[PDB]
Amino acid sequence: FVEMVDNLRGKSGQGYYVEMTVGSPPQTLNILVDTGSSNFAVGAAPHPFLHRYYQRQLSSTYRDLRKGVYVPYTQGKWEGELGTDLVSIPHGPNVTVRANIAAITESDKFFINGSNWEGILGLAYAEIARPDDSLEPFFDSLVKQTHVPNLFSLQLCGAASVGGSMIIGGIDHSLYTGSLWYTPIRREWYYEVIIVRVEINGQDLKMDCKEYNYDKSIVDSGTTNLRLPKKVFEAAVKSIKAASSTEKFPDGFWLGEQLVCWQAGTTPWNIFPVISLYLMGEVTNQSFRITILPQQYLRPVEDDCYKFAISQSSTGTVMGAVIMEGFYVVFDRARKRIGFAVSACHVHDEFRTAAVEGPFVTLDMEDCGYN
């Protein structure tokens, strides 16, 4: 799939975007790739932050669904009107499809000042599509209307100015080394998965594994951070603090409430512990583990100061860029599973490496799930 290689651009950490065209004739827009939601939504109005936006008036293939949609978030919101039109991906498969489109017409704290993207492509499932599950997500429509296989894979490389690849409909074996290992998708809403064991420097966090997936663990390209439920984060940072005692740091840094700065060229990564997540394997009692380095979780902000890219959540575990930038991630929707392999472009020093190792024995994996 050379056509699709390197078809993602972005800034740290404003997320990854792919080029898309909408309407007849094609209107080109940068759209953020987001496996954490299910709406295909674009700016339709001249907000000051946007470089461009959907002009429905120019498109003869536009159909009004006469239905509004309101998406509130933690603070801030986006609001738009629903429609269908002809969507294509110039650096993707060679097809045009008719998809639902939310024309954004009011937002707060949604678009980023300085970013280069004008909408969002929700790659996840219908159950979490706003307003409700009848609003068929983009990917369900591609697969329903063409011969494109029901899967996609993501390689997000870790560096303003980041890049990557979204392979629609297949796997490019040149993008990863070693072997894929698959975790089943627990439920088709988000890409929800079960984490069965957490290590830091290969030392167990020894928590009831139900806590790791409370109320949810998901794989999510739209989130920058590794987000852990509070207990888990508490125990994880407590463990990281310990493992990294060669140098001390203010108590606010670990809450991500300030930055931490060193001289150019002088960062000591070895003070810092590898983080291992074990994920439910394909077979009963079988698991595998993924392993990230500090280069993934200590991420430089350029305005050398790094931010601690692991934070707490009440929404569950979120395996954001921090995790995904180490691995080639296959979203195998056809077989209800997600595959991980060591990415060919992942940021690594000469000592260590991101790893996908298996198999391991883990009992009661299904009990780590929340009900």
Ligand X SMILES: CC(C)(C)C#Cc1ccccc1-c1ccc2nc(N)ccc2c1
Residues with catalytic roles: 34, 220
Would you state the structure tokens that stand for residue 238, as one six-digit string? 């407590």
Return the number of the residue (42 or 196) whose C-beta is nearest ligand X.
42
**Considering the complex, what minimum distance in angstroms separates the CB of residue 140 from ligand X?**
18
- Helix or strand holding residue 324 (H, E): helix 321-324
Return the number of the residue (223 or 239) whose C-beta is nearest ligand X.
223
**Considering the complex, what minimum distance in angstroms separates the CB of residue 110 from ligand X?**
4
- 55, 27 Cβ separation under 8 angstroms: yes
**Considering the complex, what minimum distance in angstroms separates the CB of residue 239 from ligand X?**
27
For ligand X, which residue has the nearest CB?
A: 36
CA distance 339 to 179: 9
DSSP, res 78: E
Task: For tokens 């940072």, name the residue.
Answer: 237
Return the number of the residue (37 or 153) whose C-beta is nearest ligand X.
37
Determine the Cα angle at 319 with ends 149 and 41, to 5°: 60
Q: Which residues pair with 81 in a beta bridge?
A: 68, 103
- 347, 12 Cβ separation under 8 angstroms: no
**Considering the complex, what minimum distance in angstroms separates the CB of residue 209 from ligand X?**
24
- 20, 88 Cβ separation under 8 angstroms: yes
- Whether cis (ω within 30° of 0) applies to the bond prior to 239 is no
Q: Nearest-CA neighbor of 10 among 179, 166, 209?
A: 166
Return the number of the residue (120 or 195) whose C-beta is nearest ligand X.
120
- Helix or strand holding residue 235 (H, E): helix 230-243
Task: For tokens 């740091």, name the residue.
Answer: 249
- 74, 88 Cβ separation under 8 angstroms: no
**Considering the complex, what minimum distance in angstroms separates the CB of residue 111 from ligand X?**
8
Return the number of the residue (197 or 299) whose C-beta is nearest ligand X.
299
**Considering the complex, what minimum distance in angstroms separates the CB of residue 65 from ligand X?**
20
- 340, 367 Cβ separation under 8 angstroms: no
Would you state the structure tokens that stand for residue 275, as one six-digit string? 């983080």
- 269, 353 Cβ separation under 8 angstroms: no
Q: Nearest-CA neighbor of 322 among 313, 309, 311?
A: 309
Return the number of the residue (78 or 331) whose C-beta is nearest ligand X.
78
Residues in contact with ligand X by the rule CB under 6 A: 34, 36-37, 71, 73, 76-78, 109-110, 120, 220, 222-223
